[PDB]
Amino acid sequence: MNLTELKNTPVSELITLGENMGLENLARMRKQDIIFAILKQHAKSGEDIFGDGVLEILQDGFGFLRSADSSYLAGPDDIYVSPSQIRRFNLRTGDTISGKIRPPKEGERYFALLKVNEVNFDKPENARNKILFENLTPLHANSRLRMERGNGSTEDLTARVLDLASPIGRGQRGLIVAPPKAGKTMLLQNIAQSIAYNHPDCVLMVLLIDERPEEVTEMQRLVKGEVVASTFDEPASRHVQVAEMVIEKAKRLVEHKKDVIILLDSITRLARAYNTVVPASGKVLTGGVDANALHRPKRFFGAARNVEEGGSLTIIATALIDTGSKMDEVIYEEFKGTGNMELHLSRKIAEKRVFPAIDYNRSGTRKEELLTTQEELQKMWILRKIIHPMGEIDAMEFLINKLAMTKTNDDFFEMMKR
Amino acid sequence: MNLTELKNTPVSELITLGENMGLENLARMRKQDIIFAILKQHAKSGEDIFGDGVLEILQDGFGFLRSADSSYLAGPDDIYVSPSQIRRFNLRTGDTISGKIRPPKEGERYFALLKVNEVNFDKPENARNKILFENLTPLHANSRLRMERGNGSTEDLTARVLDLASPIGRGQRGLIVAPPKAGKTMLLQNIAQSIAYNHPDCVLMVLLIDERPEEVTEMQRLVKGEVVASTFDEPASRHVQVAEMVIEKAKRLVEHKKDVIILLDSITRLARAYNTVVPASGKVLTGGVDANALHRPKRFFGAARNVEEGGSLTIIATALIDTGSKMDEVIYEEFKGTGNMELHLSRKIAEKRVFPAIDYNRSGTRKEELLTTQEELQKMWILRKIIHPMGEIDAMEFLINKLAMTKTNDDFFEMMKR
Ligand SMILES: Nc1nc2c(ncn2[C@@H]2O[C@H](COP(=O)(O)OP(=O)(O)OP(=O)(O)O)[C@@H](OP(=O)(O)OP(=O)(O)O)[C@H]2O)c(=O)[nH]1
Ligand SMILES: [Mg+2]
């Protein structure tokens, strides 16, 4: 029996399946309780069960395989694995493990792994000789990630506008400056769709911190891939835990020669959660924040890199400014010159209901010549020269108007070449 | 007899009933005590006493059927339900149980439930199979709640202004930012009347926290619905208990595919009560608040959603700003991004005796395309474009002057189009 099959099924179908098996009252308790009871009954039946999850090390030394469909939330059905297994097969937090599951015997409040048959989509033995994450050297991004949809639809307009504004490559550490009511989500959704279509091989995971519960559903419906989020109901501990699990899973994927892309929703929310969770170091920085608090956001953000051996790790993050909270621009002043590429959004442009509201003159990337070719580089340079004089809002209007008349980016290339 | 109808009777009628029943004193006791005495005297002869109430589950195992007449205050007349009944029918806190009761026996001082005949306005068997609230899928609000009644009276001006400014829908999570002496109570009263008029099907509850005793009675005599309040002369535990009972009752009602609307007089007062009642976690933010504390009010605020299966939970809570306290400031600080609808009251417009004192430029709703039609949305955009250059007080004066001339918002749009 497949645990993920039960998890993916709707709750009503789970209740009906349990009632067919029996168990009497099943509707009232949560989904995790339902799946736990159904799994226990099926194990009592005798048939072997196969389950998969993402491993995590707890402070007690034990391992837990959290599930992605629950946004890595601890639950009664969370498989728990002894440190003996971790010693037997070299494992750490973020690893994806699939195998047969032991029924919960006396003293077993959760399910446990009997035999492991898959580690990070690979055999257990082949995971021992892999190299850690930052043992691999950091290298400048060189392989361009093309996120032009190419269908000519209105959705592709923002993708190509950001592409000529500031190209994004594999392994880059992007940064988005998003004032309130600027279209941050309407940009993230398009970026996620472009990544999922143009580059299906790369693993796409979306991390949302301090989000509204209603937006999580639309994010997880629109994005083809893995969406994990922590709403504002959950404490800062949950935000930190989900962020750490996501970054560790990405690092483990990179170590396994996989290419993974992370679309972080907000650096500011993560930094606030980290400031809340960490103990005080005895020194209070400006704005009621801790020096040690700001370190772990840097640890999360700096993992974006183009590994010369196994692939890339791209982390696109968005910054919140002019929110009113002073810790927000404290975090901004911490990350002034950290991102490889920076895209700036403008509130005044968004006021006229013309989108995308970006500042083309400000938005740009460093060492762009590596990602693009010579012709693209000089074309971008002359475009910067010619749209440099006119105002940013008129610049955006002219850009969207001109890209509208052109089917693709090459049509624009030939248009400004004449 | 029925306990609820006895509770609804005035105190003098209760004393007369106790006297003609042949019971002495009953004058200087509280309402609950005289109710208990009357119930005991009638129970000595039987006649199958009835009673209903909202279930509050205590950690010891058993529960109590509180009444909304006393705003769920603990009293001698509360029905006592044993854990056996809570186990036979799956009952959680907030369930509305109605049935016959039995007189207390030797060794017990509370009336006990004898035979349940209604749970959540439904048969117990049907209520046992309901899906839990947490398993329901949140969604963006799409069904509008039109405040305007079209009467043309000067009271409808506030409703029409608010319909133009920040449209609301079933399942919204609204926030009213009100400085002191701006007119929040009158606005809440008007919203309650508009809801009771236009949408009689929705369940309307008005929750007042730390309110003055006279305002409580004013709201109870004005609002056509359920009003539960806890005055300032009560411990913060009382505020916490009342808020939790209200939210649990709302969740149970929503589980039955019902639309529930909750108007919260102050999220700031609720946050203060939670901060007082919660144990200190050792990390204290600016102003003396505990980061652990604000997790509980947020869970109250985050329950507002539009359930995909059916029903919705609208929560319109007022936030107090510029009250002269840093703790209230940080409480509002932690709550900006949670709401999908905001309405900003202005003291500058209030001091000129121009009402409603609504800051039109700084107030709005998120994703208004779903609630309103295309023509309504474009007309609203035209009006916003017209208003935007004006100052807040001039804009509100002009808007109210133009709005009073006609009767309905549609005719106002037609006139402005010309
Ligand atoms: N059709 C279209 N709309 C765009 C586009 N780009 C931006 N927008 C609009 O910009 C708004 C999105 O802003 P968000 O980033 O979602 O809001 P933020 O709070 O900054 O981030 P968050 O969603 O919390 O993570 C939406 O309008 P609101 O009604 O929510 O703003 P309004 O609320 O003023 O009515 C979008 O419709 C685009 O390319 N096409
Ligand atoms: Mg956001």
PDB file of N, CA and C in Angstrom, chain B residues 7 59 80 92 94 116 164 232-233 245 287 298 339 347 373 382 388 396 407:
ATOM      1  N   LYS B   7     -34.797  31.669  30.673  1.00  0.00           N
ATOM      2  CA  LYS B   7     -33.671  32.594  30.694  1.00  0.00           C
ATOM      3  C   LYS B   7     -34.002  33.893  29.975  1.00  0.00           C
ATOM      4  N   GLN B  59     -10.697  20.585  30.143  1.00  0.00           N
ATOM      5  CA  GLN B  59      -9.594  19.636  30.042  1.00  0.00           C
ATOM      6  C   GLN B  59      -9.784  18.426  30.945  1.00  0.00           C
ATOM      7  N   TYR B  80     -24.524  20.061  32.559  1.00  0.00           N
ATOM      8  CA  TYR B  80     -23.274  19.325  32.673  1.00  0.00           C
ATOM      9  C   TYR B  80     -23.378  18.058  31.837  1.00  0.00           C
ATOM     10  N   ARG B  92     -17.504  18.542  20.001  1.00  0.00           N
ATOM     11  CA  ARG B  92     -16.382  19.424  20.260  1.00  0.00           C
ATOM     12  C   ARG B  92     -16.897  20.736  20.833  1.00  0.00           C
ATOM     13  N   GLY B  94     -18.066  24.351  21.192  1.00  0.00           N
ATOM     14  CA  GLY B  94     -18.800  25.178  20.262  1.00  0.00           C
ATOM     15  C   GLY B  94     -20.043  24.539  19.683  1.00  0.00           C
ATOM     16  N   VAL B 116     -29.939  13.703  24.179  1.00  0.00           N
ATOM     17  CA  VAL B 116     -29.740  14.665  23.102  1.00  0.00           C
ATOM     18  C   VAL B 116     -30.774  14.414  22.016  1.00  0.00           C
ATOM     19  N   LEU B 164     -18.730  51.511  -1.943  1.00  0.00           N
ATOM     20  CA  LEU B 164     -17.875  52.084  -2.978  1.00  0.00           C
ATOM     21  C   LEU B 164     -16.401  51.937  -2.627  1.00  0.00           C
ATOM     22  N   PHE B 232     -14.915  45.733  30.411  1.00  0.00           N
ATOM     23  CA  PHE B 232     -13.555  45.924  30.900  1.00  0.00           C
ATOM     24  C   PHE B 232     -13.389  45.485  32.347  1.00  0.00           C
ATOM     25  N   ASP B 233     -14.462  45.483  33.132  1.00  0.00           N
ATOM     26  CA  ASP B 233     -14.362  45.080  34.527  1.00  0.00           C
ATOM     27  C   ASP B 233     -14.425  43.565  34.656  1.00  0.00           C
ATOM     28  N   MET B 245     -14.945  30.759  22.601  1.00  0.00           N
ATOM     29  CA  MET B 245     -16.275  30.188  22.428  1.00  0.00           C
ATOM     30  C   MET B 245     -16.918  30.682  21.143  1.00  0.00           C
ATOM     31  N   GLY B 287       7.297  47.304  23.550  1.00  0.00           N
ATOM     32  CA  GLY B 287       6.003  47.605  24.117  1.00  0.00           C
ATOM     33  C   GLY B 287       5.515  46.628  25.162  1.00  0.00           C
ATOM     34  N   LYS B 298      -3.979  35.653  16.119  1.00  0.00           N
ATOM     35  CA  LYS B 298      -3.861  35.383  14.691  1.00  0.00           C
ATOM     36  C   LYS B 298      -4.673  34.158  14.299  1.00  0.00           C
ATOM     37  N   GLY B 339      -4.966  40.821   6.574  1.00  0.00           N
ATOM     38  CA  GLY B 339      -6.276  41.047   6.001  1.00  0.00           C
ATOM     39  C   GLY B 339      -6.238  41.240   4.498  1.00  0.00           C
ATOM     40  N   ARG B 347      -9.259  60.546  11.814  1.00  0.00           N
ATOM     41  CA  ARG B 347      -9.685  61.522  12.810  1.00  0.00           C
ATOM     42  C   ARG B 347      -9.764  62.920  12.214  1.00  0.00           C
ATOM     43  N   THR B 373     -18.895  42.904 -10.577  1.00  0.00           N
ATOM     44  CA  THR B 373     -19.001  42.631 -11.999  1.00  0.00           C
ATOM     45  C   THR B 373     -18.025  43.515 -12.773  1.00  0.00           C
ATOM     46  N   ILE B 382     -12.980  54.266 -12.326  1.00  0.00           N
ATOM     47  CA  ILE B 382     -13.146  55.651 -12.763  1.00  0.00           C
ATOM     48  C   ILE B 382     -13.319  56.569 -11.560  1.00  0.00           C
ATOM     49  N   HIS B 388      -8.607  60.329  -6.502  1.00  0.00           N
ATOM     50  CA  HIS B 388      -7.216  60.223  -6.056  1.00  0.00           C
ATOM     51  C   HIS B 388      -6.503  61.556  -5.857  1.00  0.00           C
ATOM     52  N   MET B 396     -13.692  62.990   0.795  1.00  0.00           N
ATOM     53  CA  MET B 396     -14.850  62.438   1.488  1.00  0.00           C
ATOM     54  C   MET B 396     -16.033  63.397   1.444  1.00  0.00           C
ATOM     55  N   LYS B 407     -30.231  58.066  -4.927  1.00  0.00           N
ATOM     56  CA  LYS B 407     -30.740  57.045  -4.021  1.00  0.00           C
ATOM     57  C   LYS B 407     -29.906  55.770  -4.015  1.00  0.00           C
TER      58      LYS B 407
END
